[PDB]
Amino acid sequence: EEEDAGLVAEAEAVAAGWMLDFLCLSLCRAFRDGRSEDFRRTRNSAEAIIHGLSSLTACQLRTIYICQFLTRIAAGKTLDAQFENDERITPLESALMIWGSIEKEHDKLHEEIQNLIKIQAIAVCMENGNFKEAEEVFERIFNSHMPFKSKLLMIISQKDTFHSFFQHFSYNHMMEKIKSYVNYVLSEKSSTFLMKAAAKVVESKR
Amino acid sequence: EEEDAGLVAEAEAVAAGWMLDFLCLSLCRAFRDGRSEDFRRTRNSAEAIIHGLSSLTACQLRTIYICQFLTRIAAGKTLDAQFENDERITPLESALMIWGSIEKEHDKLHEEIQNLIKIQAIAVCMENGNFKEAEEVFERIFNSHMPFKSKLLMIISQKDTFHSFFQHFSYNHMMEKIKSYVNYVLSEKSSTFLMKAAAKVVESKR
Ligand SMILES: CCOc1ccc(S(=O)(=O)O)c2ccccc12
Ligand SMILES: CCOc1ccc(S(=O)(=O)O)c2ccccc12
Ligand SMILES: [Ca+2]
Ligand SMILES: [Ca+2]
Structure with a gap:
């Protein structure tokens, strides 16, 4: 009857929740491994599942934010990508905004990733x-470390695109620090229902 | 190590397989219920998951075919949709081709759905x-029932878009016969892993 349709819709929301956790875990692994194409395909899958979900728990929203964060980070050098309704916000600025919004501990790594994103947003x-x-980008990002802020401005004014400072704080550094964070997210999500059930099936055929 | 990545990829293929079955079941229900928007969103989700799957079992391919079939049937009146590399093939012709390819019993209902699709492809x-x-469309579709074939040609020549024959065999009739088939697919898939596990969770909270 009408309650059977409601029970079906509830079961659908439960399965969509499990699918979102699995797709996040898959996206995090792809990012960690540098599996570009798998990240792209998993990103399409994660976005599609999320559009079919209406009620989001606090943990599911953090999960969505991490997926959006890694997507914007991966598109960091793609200045033609528009991730916000404001067409002026570059992908690394968009990633920085999400990084400042995640309900997560503000540890040392967090601040290092944040400062690395700020530098690379300019670079x-x-x-x-x-x-x-x-x-x-500089004026939108920057209160903040004055010495740090000043150096960047000097470099911008000097128009030295290839400046040594950016080597000490390279995009790679930014990527490796972000990959260490992704490694911690992976530990937390490797225990979710779908991955756990899929792993047991694979282990029972060995 | 490298075998851990292989085990992860295997677990991913197992979870993608479970997600495909659930999304088919969801798509079938949406079609049966006339939930247009849910069908559209679930179709995007099913396509995305399928692009992340490499090896397909015979049953998974039949499942994909049913999803493509219901998508083309739903887009039957959308003559601007191109479902095949050949730009001339209309959505109902595309649905008819998939209907002739599914590994399924050729029962009475099957032939009725087939004849209804042929009539409506012209209508x-x-x-x-x-x-x-x-x-x-007529020349591509049509060996076949000569009386049937002749009537259609007459109607086409008479250019009577609104002809009575199409009422006796309306798009609605085609939709209702297809919905009876969808009802049988739903019974077969309501027992798949994801739906079954999601339903148990919902039932344990009642
Ligand atoms: C609410 C729908 O979900 C998403 C929307 C947008 C993006 S993005 O623009 O590519 O950042 C996502 C990226 C990853 C996962 C989900 C995403
Ligand atoms: C192989 C990717 O999957 C699909 C491709 C195309 C369509 S269609 O063009 O919209 O028919 C699908 C429709 C439903 C499910 C999966 C589909
Ligand atoms: Ca730009
Ligand atoms: Ca056309």
Whole structure:
């Protein structure tokens, strides 16, 4: 009857919840491994499942945020990507905003990732010859470490796209620090229902 | 190590297999219920999961075919949709081709659905004033019941878009016969892992 349709819709929301956790775990692994194409396909799958979910728990929203964060980080050098309704916000600025919104511990790693994203948000503009855009990214991002802030401005003004500072704080560094965080998310999600049940099936055939 | 990555990829294929069965079941229910928007969102989810699957069992391929069939049937009046690399194949012709490919029993219902799709493949062209396209659909579809074939041609030639024959064999009739088939697919898939586990969770909270 009508209650059977409600029970079906509830079961659908439970399965969508399990699918979201599995797809996050898969997306995190793909990011960690540098499996570009798998990340792209899993991102499409995760977005599709999320559009079929109406009520989100606090943990599911954090999970969605992490997926959006890693997507924006991966698209960090793609200045043609628009991740926000405001067309001016670059992908690394968008990632920084989500990083500042996640309900997570503000540990040392957190601040290192944050500072690395800020530096690289400017650097990727410099590297594309977008000098006026680097200044605008700078003003939106920056209260903050004055010495740090000043150095960047100098570099922007000097228009030295290839400056040594960005080597000490390279995109790679930003990626490796983010991958260490992804490793901790993976430990927490490797125990979710779908992955756990799929792993037991694989282990029973060995 | 490298075998852990292989075990992870295997577990991913197992979970993708379970997700495909659940999404088919969800798509079938949405079609049966006339839940247009849910069908659209679930279709996006099912397509995304399928792009992340490499090895398909015979049963998974039949499942994919049913999803593609119901999608083309739902888009039957959308003559702007191109479902095949050949731009001339209308959605109902595309659905008819998949219907002729499914590894399923050729029972009475099967042939009724098939004949109803053939009639409606012509009717939806007539209804749009696409008289030359109805003739071309006719020649591609039609060996076949000569009386049946002849009547259609007469109607096409008479250009009577609104002809009584199509009432006796309406799009609705085609939809209701297809919904009876969907009801049998639902019984077969309501027992799959994801739906079964999600239903037990919902039932334990009652
Ligand atoms: C609410 C739908 O979900 C998403 C929307 C947008 C993006 S993004 O624009 O590509 O960042 C996602 C990226 C990953 C996972 C889910 C996403
Ligand atoms: C192989 C990817 O999967 C699909 C591809 C295309 C369509 S369709 O064009 O919309 O028919 C699907 C429709 C439903 C389910 C999966 C589909
Ligand atoms: Ca841009
Ligand atoms: Ca057309």
